[PDB]
Amino acid sequence: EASVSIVVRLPITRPTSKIRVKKIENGVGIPVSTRKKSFPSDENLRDYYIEWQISFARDGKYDYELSRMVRLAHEHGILTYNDIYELLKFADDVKSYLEDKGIRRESTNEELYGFNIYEDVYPVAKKELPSGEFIGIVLKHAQRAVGYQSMVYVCIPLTNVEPSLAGRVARRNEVVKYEVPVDLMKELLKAFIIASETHKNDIVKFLRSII
Amino acid sequence: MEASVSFENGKIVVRLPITRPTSKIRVKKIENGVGIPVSTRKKSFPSDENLRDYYIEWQISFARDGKYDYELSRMVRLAHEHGILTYNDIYELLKFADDVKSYLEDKGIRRESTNEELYGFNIYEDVYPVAKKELPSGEFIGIVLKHAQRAVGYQSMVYVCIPLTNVEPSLAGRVARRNEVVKYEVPVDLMKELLKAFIIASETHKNDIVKFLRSII
Amino acid sequence: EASVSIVVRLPITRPTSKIRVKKIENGVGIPVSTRKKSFPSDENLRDYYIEWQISFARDGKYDYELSRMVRLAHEHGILTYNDIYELLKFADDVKSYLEDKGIRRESTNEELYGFNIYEDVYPVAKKELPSGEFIGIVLKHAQRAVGYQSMVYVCIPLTNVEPSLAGRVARRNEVVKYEVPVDLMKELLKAFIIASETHKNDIVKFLRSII
Amino acid sequence: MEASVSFENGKIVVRLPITRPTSKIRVKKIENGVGIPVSTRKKSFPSDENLRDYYIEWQISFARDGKYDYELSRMVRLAHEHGILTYNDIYELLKFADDVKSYLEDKGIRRESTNEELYGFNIYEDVYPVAKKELPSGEFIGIVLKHAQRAVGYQSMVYVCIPLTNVEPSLAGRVARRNEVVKYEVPVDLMKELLKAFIIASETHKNDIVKFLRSII
DNA sequence: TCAGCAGTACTAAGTACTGCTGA
DNA sequence: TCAGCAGTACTAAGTACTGCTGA
Numbered sequence: 001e002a003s004v005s006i007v008v009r010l011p012i013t014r015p016t017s018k019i020r021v022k023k024i025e026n027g028v029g030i031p032v033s034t035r036k037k038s039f040p041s042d043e044n045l046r047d048y049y050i051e052w053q054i055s056f057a058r059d060g061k062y063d064y065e066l067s068r069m070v071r072l073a074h075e076h077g078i079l080t081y082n083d084i085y086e087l088l089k090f091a092d093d094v095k096s097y098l099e100d101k102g103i104r105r106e107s108t109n110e111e112l113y114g115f116n117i118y119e120d121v122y123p124v125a126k127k128e129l130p131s132g133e134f135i136g137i138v139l140k141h142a143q144r145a146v147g148y149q150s151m152v153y154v155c156i157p158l159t160n161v162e163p164s165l166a167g168r169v170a171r172r173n174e175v176v177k178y179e180v181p182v183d184l185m186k187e188l189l190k191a192f193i194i195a196s197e198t199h200k201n202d203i204v205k206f207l208r209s210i211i
Numbered sequence: 212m213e214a215s216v217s218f219e220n221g222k223i224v225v226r227l228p229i230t231r232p233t234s235k236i237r238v239k240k241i242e243n244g245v246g247i248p249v250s251t252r253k254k255s256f257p258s259d260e261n262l263r264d265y266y267i268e269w270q271i272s273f274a275r276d277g278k279y280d281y282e283l284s285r286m287v288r289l290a291h292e293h294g295i296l297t298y299n300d301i302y303e304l305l306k307f308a309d310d311v312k313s314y315l316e317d318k319g320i321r322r323e324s325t326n327e328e329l330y331g332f333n334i335y336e337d338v339y340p341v342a343k344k345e346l347p348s349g350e351f352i353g354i355v356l357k358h359a360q361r362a363v364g365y366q367s368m369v370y371v372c373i374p375l376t377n378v379e380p381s382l383a384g385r386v387a388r389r390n391e392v393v394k395y396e397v398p399v400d401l402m403k404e405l406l407k408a409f410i411i412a413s414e415t416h417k418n419d420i421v422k423f424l425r426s427i428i
Numbered sequence: 429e430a431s432v433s434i435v436v437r438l439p440i441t442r443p444t445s446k447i448r449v450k451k452i453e454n455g456v457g458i459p460v461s462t463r464k465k466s467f468p469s470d471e472n473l474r475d476y477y478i479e480w481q482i483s484f485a486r487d488g489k490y491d492y493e494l495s496r497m498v499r500l501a502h503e504h505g506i507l508t509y510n511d512i513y514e515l516l517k518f519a520d521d522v523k524s525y526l527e528d529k530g531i532r533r534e535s536t537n538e539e540l541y542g543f544n545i546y547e548d549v550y551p552v553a554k555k556e557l558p559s560g561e562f563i564g565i566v567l568k569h570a571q572r573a574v575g576y577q578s579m580v581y582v583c584i585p586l587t588n589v590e591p592s593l594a595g596r597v598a599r600r601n602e603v604v605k606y607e608v609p610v611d612l613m614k615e616l617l618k619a620f621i622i623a624s625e626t627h628k629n630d631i632v633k634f635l636r637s638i639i
Numbered sequence: 640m641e642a643s644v645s646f647e648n649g650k651i652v653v654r655l656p657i658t659r660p661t662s663k664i665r666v667k668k669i670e671n672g673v674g675i676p677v678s679t680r681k682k683s684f685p686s687d688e689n690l691r692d693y694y695i696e697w698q699i700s701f702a703r704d705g706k707y708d709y710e711l712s713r714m715v716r717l718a719h720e721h722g723i724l725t726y727n728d729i730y731e732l733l734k735f736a737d738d739v740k741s742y743l744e745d746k747g748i749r750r751e752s753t754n755e756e757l758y759g760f761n762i763y764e765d766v767y768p769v770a771k772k773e774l775p776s777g778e779f780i781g782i783v784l785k786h787a788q789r790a791v792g793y794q795s796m797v798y799v800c801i802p803l804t805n806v807e808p809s810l811a812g813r814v815a816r817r818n819e820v821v822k823y824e825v826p827v828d829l830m831k832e833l834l835k836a837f838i839i840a841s842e843t844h845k846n847d848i849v850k851f852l853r854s855i856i
Numbered sequence: 857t858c859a860g861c862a863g864t865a866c867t868a869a870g871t872a873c874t875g876c877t878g879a
Numbered sequence: 880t881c882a883g884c885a886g887t888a889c890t891a892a893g894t895a896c897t898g899c900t901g902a
Contacts, residue, residue, distance in 0.1 A: 640863065640864095659863065662863050662864075663863085663864085788865090788866090789866075
């Protein structure tokens with residue numbers, strides 16, 4: 001698990017967790033064995049990033065990861081009253097969500113040696129922030145039943161993270177400190193707001209709880 | 212977990228578990244055109260019509276350890292050993308493999324840009340290729356492409372969807388038993404279409420099929 | 429580590445430790461993957477055993493594994509006064525040790541395609557106890573400098589150990605309970621006594637400390 | 640850790656670390672006929688006579704991943720590529736491998752019973768076979784047999800012991816430097832005797848040598 | 857300094873997450 | 880029951896034990 005201080009502490013040596021270090025190779029993120037291969041010391045270090053599938057709530061109660069960040073920052077004045085207003089007014093005007101895009105199987109007129117060829121289109125929402133972080137919203141078929149489930153990711157470059165790991169392997173159970181910018185937390189909220197009405201309704205009544 | 216492969220009464224038979232919903236073999240139910248997972252141990256199968264929408268989806272593999280002693284190759288070997296798959300069957304399967312020049316892997320995976328935005332968030336569409344074929348006996352065979360997670364490139368995977376009416380015993384109107392597996396007699400034509408599926412999935416898959424088929428002949 | 433209760437608690441899922449489960453195969457003990465292969469339910473379970481390279485002292489002070497067993501059993505009257513006397517009188521009469529046998533390289537008159545062929549002989553002391561346990565004393569070249577180091581092993585059959593693991597895989601961090609017979613503890617002491625004068629001198633003054 | 644293998648001035652050169660006493664490459668000192676480990680970073684090498692008793696013992700391997708791009712095969716390949724190991728050298732090495740009919744592995748490992756007891760404890764003698772050869776250039780090559788720990792059977796391992804006088808720089812009268820590695824020019828005759836050592840160690844080792852030598856020729 | 861790596865080779869743990877099994 | 884396995888696929892941890900490295 002990641003501990004939240006505002007600041008968070010993310011482990012580097014758990015590629016099977018929701019927090020995993022990846023490296024851009026041939027355009028796709030691939031898992032990195034941070035303990036058998038030394039991190040590059042040059043410009044390639046920008047191609048490395050931590051992928052954190054961030055969650056909003058736990059136990060149906062609002063104090064885990066993102067929800068803990070946001071309210072810690074209101075209690076510290078980091079988020080003004082009007083931050084939460086315009087976050088909610090933004091939610092009040094949001095009609096469509098990535099869930100509304102859904103997952104479709106489009107039929108092509110192609111036949112591969114007797115096999116009919118189709119295409120599955122998956123909708124993805126992506127936003128880049130000036131400091132280098134990326135926010136990803138992906139759609140997946142609900143494993144429990146009919147419908148969709150939306151999931152939010154935060155991609156943090158290893159250059160935005162200290163101690164700098166250039167020219168060495170990771171430490172055992174290494175946990176590294178990342179200062180959380182203010183507008184990442186609010187763009188993360190907006191990410192949940194535009195993911196699904198289910199996510200927005202929970203973000204909406206969480207912001208109302210402290211405003 | 213692995214499914215039992217056996218020969219009985221001149222038929223290749225596989226025993227498919229129906230109580231491991233998290234495995235390569237899982238019982239599903241089509242609801243509005245999407246296969247939904249089924250908790251076969253708490254909700255009872257319907258005894259009425261629309262039991263057809265229930266099926267077994269089997270993510271079948273051909274190779275293991277660079278060897279051909281696993282699932283499909285186990286079935287094909289037994290079928291060859293028992294005269295179920297004849298010399299002419301395998302010879303012409305190899306001729307079909309020689310003629311195949313394009314593969315499902317050639318379609319690739321692309322991320323399309325869109326004219327759409329969602330409240331300041333850029334919208335992309337990742338399209339994935341799938342190959343589907345319906346057999347007259349009721350089964351479906353699907354080939355989906357995906358990114359090779361550890362390397363770069365693609366890996367293709369073959370699925371066979373078996374309707375519950377094609378397996379025994381009849382599960383109509385009851386909950387699956389503890390550790391229950393169903394008896395599925397594999398038609399000869401399905402084994403051919405499954406071998407062909409691996410042939411057109413990717414060149415790497417085809418040369419595995421060709422090497423196994425030629426070693427048996 | 430193994431906890432001592434007299435009774436000890438030995439972990440089953442650490443093949444790289446001093447405590448490892450082995451199975452006799454082709455006459456030699458081979459490591460067992462107690463989590464990927466199910467233990468046999470039949471007579472083959474007798475071929476499985478726990479190999480524990482037992483230590484006598486730690487921190488140069490006498491209260492670790494064997495030394496903790498022995499004095500716990502004197503304090504409980506499990507070892508009489510004359511047990512420790514005849515253990516020491518046995519030590520007082522012991523002249524030779526397995527270390528005195530040493531490791532030799534004997535030369536054969538054979539030549540394998542221009543290569544001279546020799547034989548290294550390693551001395552081993554072995555004793556079987558009626559309940560099935562084995563005690564092994566092996567000699568190894570001292571890794572630190574000139575000389576030898578002696579090491580004592582206890583081989584415990586899986587049939588002498590509960591819960592019975594027939595027909596299943598081990599539990600995670602599984603620790604299993606073994607009741608320690610009285611004469612195993614004293615034959616273990618005698619094992620250290622006949623291993624080397626260095627080991628005997630420490631056993632000797634340990635027994636004198638509580639007698 | 641792995642030793643650097645390179646070609647320079649018509650000589651195959653390996654760079655051997657002398658500050659990793661726990662590795663496959665470790666500095667030893669013979670005291671009364673036994674190689675004792677040396678702490679090369681706290682006790683200084685002698686500048687006087689009896690520095691010969693100090694040597695580097697290298698547990699050298701030929702294969703890795705079923706491939707021949709590791710240590711000895713790296714050296715032999717470079718030697719072949721640079722005319723250091725000629726066509727006639729490799730051809731007659733293969734003829735030596737064809738004639739070899741017995742191996743060090745054939746001697747086996749036995750536990751002998753003894754007429755001795757040690758105060759109620761049974762005494763056994765486990766004997767292990769070792770093959771040794773001294774080269775005129777000063778190096779020794781040893782083949783020791785051991786039980787294959789994970790399987791059953793034996794695995795043989797080749798050692799090459801290099802006296803410190805055969806490497807540069809001269810370490811007489813000083814403590815090894817931090818992360819220091821020494822330059823060792825590999826004589827052609829040693830590479831042959833090391834290839835022959837693997838040939839007579841076991842049949843499995845020989846067929847690895849024969850396959851690599853024939854692929855190079 | 858002096859905590860922690862270097863080196864070695866292999867299994868078992870961590871990992872996410874529900875049904876489901878078992879005693 | 881209800882704690883913990885079943886199933887899945889991969890790296891990183893545990894392991895013993897000293898020299899030795901590094902910041």
